[PDB]
């Protein structure tokens, strides 16, 4: 102590990165829950399932990149429990997509707060890291989910009998 | 003055070509507006967007071919402001297609007036140019848009929840 | 209720599968922690890191296969918090391997208890599932980790300066 | 209202992006005018023409990327008239290059003002977008045009009879 | 004066870039010295030599990219003497790696001061340039050297007879 | 001391090799300065730039081969500061080429003095090394630069507006 690599890396930044690692792992778990909701025999929308599973894997990648950043900068990873998602039953394709949009906006708000702290601590490496690997990816994800919610709402989800099925077999297929 | 190339090229034809260049640039801009309406998060019909973007690029090509004609004949290009489109909000896939059909018929009427002037001035090169590169392309575009309007109307656009989505993912996909 | 697919699937089996899903997710998290311990600047054994990361990914696969089994049989996945690992600092390559061996034996004991319950409930599909996809894989993993612990101990880990490095660059490389 | 995607996106940023879209479309139009000046029968420098046409197409791409950004962030595109360029007659290869350098510096100043507003509004996504896709491209364009102006001046443009021709057939060829 | 390209480029930034060019050239020279220490007949660690030679070449690239930046922005390169390194005799593989880690942290501190000046002068192009091409590369280099120092220390360098040789023929080979 | 490899290698030869290493590094730096003079926005002769950059890289190679010779013979490299070049502003393509010719003749004179010392000390290995790798390369470089100076002078450099540009785009292109 300190790490022989550590430079210009504030303890508050190190802790905020640890909190962000937990949030990305939590997001991965929410999407995993959603993926296996869509493969229930009474839901059976396999392209919704594959969509959410892919999202889950992406979140794990986001978490891992933060863990690598912690090591690269000489901070120490401190893991915490990954809380279970809010639901096992996600009710419908539309409801899952709306919950996913809210989750992505929440994660985005956390990333923006992290970038603000990094700016406050004069850490341009950390600022650049978030800008390069996180902020644009989050904007793209939010826009994609917004698009999906809009189409499902317009199509008459969740009550219209064909809407989720047609969306499954066209947009997500 | 005159250009050492100029031959059998009436000043009224030169001016009418300048007006047509502006109209084709205006059409390009209308279709650009439409393309980015369809990629709004609250519209999200990406194949409508690609359709209109392609139309926009075609209109720019039409404008450029007239600019090349002006130079080939020894006339002088005189550009004017490109007016903004009538709307940013194009309301629905059906409404955009109806507006596009009206725009194409209006551009066609201008081309027919240009051909009539070229005939009046005994300019068979200009007549041939419009016939070869413009008049049939315009008839094809009008027919395609008419077809698209018909299908959307029959399908129950804009109020029927599935119509624009199914048209997006079948006809324009 | 019941699921139109459910057959010969006891509620106690459904719950025990939910507990096993949590344990496999927990194992994934332990191995993730270990992987990023080995890429600290003050540990720097990249082949230990890759070894544990691969183990982490395998555990996630094991969890997912149980989630698929729950759906296939008409049970309902119920996720719980994934507890953080026992340590962030895993002390040495030998200590991590010893902890991993203990974790695998613990997971094995849980699988054997699950198989015993499935036998008690006359569920041969569930018995076969565990035998085909879990029990032999666990025996192989335990043997591999036992082998690695033995070599590290014989080589003089953790105090012998060359032992972990040579093991990293030969066995795990 | 607001867009279900909108987050951390200030109305002043949304308006400034709309102004920048207009400026990039205006730049595209200036370069289009220049391209077709160089293919007049009394100028006839086809590599100047191709150079400016390529620049025109690049500006349209820059405009489109801002329109996509507006949609991605949940803002609303508002288009305005595209003003005609300052000249149809661009006088000489040197004069066109000097006008293009001034236009690029003016567009750069607008981008720098946009980045300053984005910083003031704590919008790091928008800051990153301009840095990643705009600011370096503008510096490169300004340097290239500066280089071209220098060579043409040194060579004795516009009065030296060989200068524009040799530059056309070597540098731009 | 000023350069016809110069825009938003403060004289203090231009001078700080000149100082950074000298520091990167100095770093190249330190690593060149180290490379040829390791090919002495009484050291004879050819993979240490190749490692440092590669580092030397990278530093020259870093210097050249700053020289290109100076030209792109319209500043004027002003070169100074490149001071000789602190030693010809670098004592051991461990000592060279420790000196290289200190040199990289020193260069990093200079880059962070340059980024701070660029922020103070409202030069986002220069900020982006350092973030994109310098700051992450420096963090990666510091982490790699930290890793190498750790392994050599753990292995018993410099006194343990096998440590530098085994590191040479495994990690650097 | 002595090196177990050293044989027939006089201390005066070892020192003269150290002086020659410094001179070749100095030559590399002169050519680097010249290369980036030619990419200034107010010079903009990219093939002059590439020519000098290649020369710079060759000089570094010449320096490195002497450093390898020092090690092969059991001498000890002793580096000194690399002095900055005589100018940042090299005035014109002709002036740079004339300065480069003078620099190469000066380096040649040093090599001839080194060969004379090696002959005086009865060191045929060192004589052969200079003959095989240095003396003919220097004669070729001097002749090439002489040729380039002649053409630029005949063409009317530096005042004739086309001369440096045409030389850039034909001989160096
Ligand atoms: Cl620190
Ligand atoms: Cl969608
Ligand atoms: Cl329906
Ligand atoms: Cl006529
Ligand atoms: Cl149709
Ligand atoms: Cl419908
Ligand atoms: Cl049952
Ligand atoms: Cl083993
Ligand atoms: Cl040992
Ligand atoms: Cl070994
Ligand atoms: Cl907002
Ligand atoms: Cl140029
Ligand atoms: Cl001339
Ligand atoms: Cl300035
Ligand atoms: Cl290492
Ligand atoms: Cl040893
Ligand atoms: Cl001797
Ligand atoms: Cl020559
Ligand atoms: Cl001349
Ligand atoms: Fe995604
Ligand atoms: Fe990914
Ligand atoms: Fe991925
Ligand atoms: Fe992906
Ligand atoms: Fe994420
Ligand atoms: Fe809880
Ligand atoms: Fe996400
Ligand atoms: Fe920034
Ligand atoms: Fe078309
Ligand atoms: Fe076309
Ligand atoms: Fe086309
Ligand atoms: Fe087409
Ligand atoms: Fe048209
Ligand atoms: Fe108007
Ligand atoms: Fe049209
Ligand atoms: Fe395994
Ligand atoms: Fe597997
Ligand atoms: Fe696997
Ligand atoms: Fe495997
Ligand atoms: Fe497992
Ligand atoms: Fe706990
Ligand atoms: Fe396991
Ligand atoms: Fe069996
Ligand atoms: Fe360009
Ligand atoms: Fe482009
Ligand atoms: Fe392009
Ligand atoms: Fe391009
Ligand atoms: Fe632009
Ligand atoms: Fe006007
Ligand atoms: Fe531009
Ligand atoms: Fe940035
Ligand atoms: Fe490196
Ligand atoms: Fe490189
Ligand atoms: Fe390189
Ligand atoms: Fe490299
Ligand atoms: Fe560097
Ligand atoms: Fe000194
Ligand atoms: Fe470095
Ligand atoms: Fe960036
Ligand atoms: Fe050469
Ligand atoms: Fe060479
Ligand atoms: Fe070479
Ligand atoms: Fe060569
Ligand atoms: Fe040389
Ligand atoms: Fe001096
Ligand atoms: Fe030379
Ligand atoms: Fe001889
Ligand atoms: Fe010889
Ligand atoms: Mg949290
Ligand atoms: Mg009109
Ligand atoms: Mg448990
Ligand atoms: Mg404006
Ligand atoms: Mg200095
Ligand atoms: Mg000297």
UniProtKB/Swiss-Prot annotation, chains A, B, C, D, E, F:
Chief subcellular location: mitochondrion
- Give me the residues that bind Fe cation 2, please: 59, 104, 138
Which compartments is it annotated to reside in? Mitochondrion
**Annotated tissue distribution:** Detected in testis and erythroleukemia. Expression is very low or not detectable in brain, colon, heart, kidney, liver, lung, muscle, placental, spleen and small intestine.
Keywords from UniProt, A to Z, are: Iron, Iron storage, Metal-binding, Mitochondrion, Oxidoreductase, Transit peptide
| Enzyme Commission number(s) | 1.16.3.1
**One biological-process term from Gene Ontology?**
iron ion transport
> Which cysteines share a disulfide bond?
none
The subunit field of the Swiss-Prot or TrEMBL record says: Homooligomer of 24 subunits. The functional molecule is roughly spherical and contains a central cavity into which the polymeric mineral iron core is deposited.
Q: Can you name this protein?
A: Ferritin, mitochondrial
The species this protein was found in: Homo sapiens
Q: Which residues of the full protein are shown?
A: 64 to 236 of 242
